[PDB]
Design a protein around this motif. Structure first.
Motif, mmCIF file in Angstrom:
data_model
loop_
_atom_site.group_PDB
_atom_site.id
_atom_site.type_symbol
_atom_site.label_atom_id
_atom_site.label_comp_id
_atom_site.label_asym_id
_atom_site.label_seq_id
_atom_site.Cartn_x
_atom_site.Cartn_y
_atom_site.Cartn_z
ATOM 1 N N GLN E 21 0.862 -1.306 -0.052
ATOM 2 C CA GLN E 21 -0.178 -0.022 -0.087
ATOM 3 C C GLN E 21 0.978 1.373 0.132
ATOM 4 O O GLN E 21 1.997 1.265 0.436
ATOM 5 N N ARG E 23 0.725 6.178 -0.598
ATOM 6 C CA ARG E 23 -0.287 7.220 -1.141
ATOM 7 C C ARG E 23 0.674 8.362 -1.265
ATOM 8 O O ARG E 23 1.377 9.052 -0.399
ATOM 9 N N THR E 24 0.339 9.004 -2.494
ATOM 10 C CA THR E 24 1.214 10.199 -3.003
ATOM 11 C C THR E 24 0.412 11.435 -3.344
ATOM 12 O O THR E 24 -0.882 11.253 -3.288
ATOM 13 N N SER E 25 1.078 12.530 -3.123
ATOM 14 C CA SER E 25 0.143 13.663 -3.168
ATOM 15 C C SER E 25 0.325 14.669 -4.578
ATOM 16 O O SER E 25 -0.276 15.488 -4.777
ATOM 17 N N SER E 26 1.606 14.253 -5.261
ATOM 18 C CA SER E 26 2.016 14.948 -6.476
ATOM 19 C C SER E 26 1.334 14.019 -7.713
ATOM 20 O O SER E 26 0.734 12.897 -7.652
ATOM 21 N N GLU E 30 8.669 10.271 -9.170
ATOM 22 C CA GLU E 30 9.873 9.518 -9.809
ATOM 23 C C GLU E 30 9.964 8.609 -8.883
ATOM 24 O O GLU E 30 9.922 8.649 -7.531
ATOM 25 N N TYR E 31 10.815 7.755 -9.170
ATOM 26 C CA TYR E 31 11.376 6.660 -8.186
ATOM 27 C C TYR E 31 12.745 5.887 -8.848
ATOM 28 O O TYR E 31 13.087 6.081 -10.020
ATOM 29 N N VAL E 32 13.408 5.219 -8.106
ATOM 30 C CA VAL E 32 14.484 4.301 -8.584
ATOM 31 C C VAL E 32 14.039 2.855 -8.290
ATOM 32 O O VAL E 32 14.202 2.356 -6.788
ATOM 33 N N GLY E 182 1.531 -22.508 1.141
ATOM 34 C CA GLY E 182 1.643 -21.176 2.128
ATOM 35 C C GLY E 182 1.690 -19.926 1.527
ATOM 36 O O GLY E 182 1.873 -19.153 2.230
ATOM 37 N N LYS E 189 -10.660 -12.460 -12.523
ATOM 38 C CA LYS E 189 -11.004 -13.062 -13.721
ATOM 39 C C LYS E 189 -10.054 -12.347 -14.849
ATOM 40 O O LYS E 189 -9.894 -12.867 -15.799
#
Lengths: 256, 250, 248, 254, 255, 248, 247
Positions: E21, E23-26, E30-32, E182, E189
């Motif tokens: 989970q 949550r962003t605000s923009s 961006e990410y790496v 496990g 679907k």
């Protein structure tokens, strides 16, 4: 005679009384209906109606004692309790269970209940299985089982039993003390005959009506009970029992 | 408290009560083992006195100080000697002097013509329950010697099979759905059955108390004070016919 | 203390006292005499012996850190009970030791061992031998090993003597609480009405002390941790306690 | 320097089995009850000095610059990802810990092996565990918690007793649906087919030297060019094993 | 207006619940994610490749009676079961797999790493097929989380027997638990037959939320509006991320 | 009040309204092959019908004591709901009756049974056709008799499909709410995602009226006691429901 | 009217405030000379309800004078002729009462004269009644079994007791007759109804009217009813004797 009226009874066991719906009344007899449910094949499996009527009987429990002492010591207070009320309440089931419905006797459930269809149980069926079948038959009446009326003895048996494995079924002795079974309460009483068992949806099946709460009375003058200085104590209750849907109950006998 | 009650004593088996007199009269339902008709029951203007039973166990003369120390010894070690011992008078008593009219005193002899060829050491009891109904009553429970109970419970046939025998049973102390009371107060081979539920109740006059005498009899000579727990009871009998006494044919 | 078993201390009556010595009479019953069957008292005396458990660690870091408290209070404290049960269960009443139940306990009638009995049937007969004291059985004491066997013990019947192995869990054996432990040697077992056969008096609460010069702690730079408990055992009717071992 | 906030996985972890603690020292010593599985006599408990040291456990991961400290998207990146993995990674050390370097002396390593000589013939996985709960008592300690792998726990969760009957009960959050009263902790740390039990309640204890703190970089390595800020979250603690004999490790030899 | 909470059936955990989970605000982020090479024993080190995530908008529509809306009691009971349950089926189609084009999202299968067919055998059981998947998940030293596949395939996998009626590891109950080896299972679907996905979605990638599912009602608007007589709707803004695609495997059951 | 058995009404979504009728869109989902498997739409409408439960009896006690409440209280209602399932489970859309699920349900795919499938193996396959609606199964509905046999069923290996006769009680099957009701005809079953496929709206809580005035209840000392209830059953995606039968 | 209150004016009347009556019924014992004493047997009597209904129209209806005259002049009486059925021939199950004939006693043929008429038999019945220690009060017959009797002629071409002139209303041997169709021809009944038994009226005759009854509301037409709740009892069954002319 006069009324040292008041003291009520109490037991650690659930009386059949609790198993039936509670409703007071103000009459000597009343008239209801009986859903004559036809164990009718798949189609018009509809339930007929029957114009029935029930009468308000009276249960009583008495016992003699000495005047002086009794009327002097608090022994009385307790006397009626564990002796009278205990007995009366106990005897009460005698009617609500194996009642004869004659003269002053109430129409017992068993005497009305529907026999057990041994047609269901089949080879290799432990008593546990039997009950399993019972719970069902009580459904064909559109009503679900509520509780089981069993004799102490035969309860002890069923309670603790393995399963061709060290597994204990139902948990007895832990849960064995009345408590419950499969989730349905069990009412162990002396009244219930041996080998004979009864199960049904008393929850919604039959109902009991009270015309007069139990009361005690004593007469210094009964049966020459005056000359022998030994008054008599009595406790009676006015009530009637109405069996709405019989099929909602079944009575059988284990494979003796 | 006295909860080494790993069993239920006769006091718990019989019906409780309470009085304010020092004695009380009652009507003994002389129930005849009448034939089918009458066969009627009779009444007798009897009565019941009030004896004072107590248990004593002489101890050392110093422990008298450590209070909390003395406390439990009393409650725990002490009652039981009370109630246990109490359970004795209730079971059987000479009904004379300070002895209560024990159940055995009035208990009805066990019919012998009911004994078959031919019947297990338990079958005898089975018959008892029936003979009890011969008084228009049910069975409350059974009272027998702690040993004999062992033989009954831990009992198999020619093969190794626990017939209603199961170490479990002993633990439960119940058979045929009837409460069993293993008490060494009753001689072996002996047994008592009946509808004690309402066959006879008990009346409580004065609860358990405690008294100690350094001065008293042995405590000097014992050289330590002797504690004592008193109690006042009143045993009654409404229908002796609802009680059966006897032994095992040996 | 701990959270699991059931400490023999729970079986034996409790209480406390002021004096470091107590007095009492012993119901030394003439059990098996088919003639005058009574009991004879035996004026005895209780000795308040102080028992404690040893536990090293290092003081200098510790006498600063908060947690060590959360240690002995929750952990080390248990180490006491385990050692406690020991003395009580049995020991040479010599010295600072107490009269162990096993020492004063009674023998076990081998005559009862009928052909056909199992290691589980043994304890059963024992239960009876207890009634001889006029008292009744309250709890049984064994070691994990034997208990294990007895618990998960099938029969040629092809079934458990008690239900599934679950039995082992929640030590209850025929309505009589069980207590597995190391204090009870292997093969040895004990039963009786501990509830009312013997009473334990608590003199003072367990006290703790720390030091380095203790034993060989000055070489391991570790400070010793101990907790002394002053308690004292007393036996009333020893004939109630039954001691015995299996045939195997 | 970051604002702060704590974390916790859905269900419980081993961190809950060991007795909690804390310290203000970079290390500390203690003593080990070398319990011999000694025959009936002198079954006594030898002693060992031994020493515990504070180790450092941290998790890191990188992300945008101007897009980062300008949106509440930060917390969510730590609370769900960093922390999530942190505690998850933590278990590994406590459970399967190597010791050398920043590695914590793992329980499994110090734990006492299982006694295969203690199983009979018609035994199932369920039986084995029972035998295990037993061998845990030989250390004068009672069992306290079970540690199996999800892929394995799920199995035991549903078994028939040679009759349809379910043991331990039907599948009910089967883990929560702890067996034999004792708690169960199915993690990825523990290997498949491998299990560890014992009295974690008293067997060992844990000490927290430093809570979970987070720091940023922007400077690190060659991230100043690719503007890849590196977020780190560390913590300082020490695992101490008191009576290793109070813990057993085995495997369902297939 | 402003709602409180969704509440779908909950008889099965959607991929959303499976994934991490967030949550962003923009309106962008961006990410790496290190591109983990399936590098041989040595420099098996993971390269760090910069990326960018777009905040797409997803709309869920349910026809609403004009009368139903006016009363508070009538409308709400249908809605709570109605909005959340609808959304999970709806969110998948983008989460599970998407062109990630127009308003779509970077579907798991889109960046998923093809299954290693050179792992199969003479004929591994249809179940063993998945077994290899979990193993390959280690290709990126990551512990598999859950498994998402077509519901039908699940059926065949669960109900398995040897030359005897021997419900394999599988069985009727297991199907009910939706958890094998496990590991969680999401019989959505959204997946077609023979199409599966395995990996550690627990940390393999997290989804961010921009704006909770809202609701808009119109009469004229949309194709239905022509149908009439009233309209209902759910706008929602989410963002699916992926740090290590290697942690996700796609592949296909052929046979 | 306290019925014990879980009523369908507890298996279908619930909600209320203030109108006499509702409109919605029936997602006519085609079991369309791989491509345009899309779902058509139908402008359907629900009508808030009215159902009740009547009983006849002599007011001799119905108006001479407050116990009458007591009767209508926990005894009759039970009868109401008991008949409530009637309409829901299956009712002719004609008249006051409602759209019975069976009357709106989809046929069963016999293509799934295979020699060797047991009563239970069937209902199993049934759970599958439920997924066809893109939704999953939430509960099953069988006649008490059927549930019985199905429950404690065995095979060669002396074992129950669910390990114990008890299965009956605490109705469950692979973790799927089972509801045994006479309403369901024997040899007939029905499953699907009742949870999210059909909703019920309340227009008026249970109510009761009394009037000897009715029929010939006057000439005969009697009285008709009854309690109406206003409801409306909707079927958004009926495909989410399956029904079929067994051998007998 | 009959002015003979049908069967009711013959049995002791009373009132009651319940639905059941626990009375003591004296099972007498003709027996023989000695312990001719009478046993006692707890008995219960349920309270049943019965009424008379008659259809009517409203326009020609709701007129106070008309209505308030139709009822207490005709209706009220008409009900009696109906309730008479239960009393006389009553059954014991359902909404039926315990009719006298059901508890009556079989007539002794033994007293029949070598050669007598039907009238003579009745006399025997009267005597047979005193056997219960109770004197007889009334008689029950069926119009026709009263026809021939009223036309019993001596071959002396002359009536018996009867003369058109020498005669009165229903009365014979000094006791009422109460001719009724409710009684099966041939089968008669006699006894001291005075103390034989008594009825209890839980509530006096009540009259109600309804429109929504059946197809009246359409066929504008109305329905008037006179409900009545009561219950009778039985003390000495031997007091009531039922006989069937074997001729």
């Amino acid at each position: 005679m006069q009324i040292p009226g008041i003291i009520m009874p109490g037991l650690r066991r659930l009386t059949i009384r609790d198993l039936l719906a509670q409703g007071r009344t103000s009459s000597n007899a009343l008239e209801y209906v009986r859903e004559e449910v036809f164990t009718n094949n798949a189609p018009e499996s509809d339930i007929t109606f029957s114009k029935q009527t029930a009468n308000v009987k009276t249960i009583a429990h008495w016992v003699q004692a000495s005047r002086q002492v009794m009327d002097d010591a608090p022994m009385l207070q307790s006397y009626i309790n564990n002796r009278l009320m205990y007995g009366l309440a106990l005897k009460e089931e005698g009617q609500l269970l194996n009642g004869d419905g004659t003269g002053d006797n109430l129409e017992g459930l068993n005497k009305v209940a529907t026999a057990y269809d041994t047609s269901l149980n089949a080879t290799g069926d432990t008593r546990a299985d039997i009950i399993a079948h019972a719970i069902y038959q009580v459904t064909e009446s559109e009503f679900s089982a509520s509780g089981i009326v069993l004799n102490p003895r035969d309860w002890h048996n069923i309670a603790l039993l393995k399963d061709n494995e060290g597994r204990y079924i139902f948990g007895g002795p832990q849960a064995f003390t009345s408590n419950i079974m499969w989730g349905l309460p069990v009412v162990p009483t002396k009244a219930q005959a041996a080998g004979t068992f009864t199960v049904g949806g008393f929850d919604m099946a039959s109902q009991v009506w009270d015309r007069m709460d139990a009361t005690v009375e004593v007469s210094r003058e009964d049966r020459d009970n005056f000359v022998k200085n030994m008054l008599t104590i009595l406790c009676e209750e006015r009530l009637a029992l109405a069996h709405y849907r019989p099929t909602a109950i079944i009575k059988g006998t284990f494979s003796s």
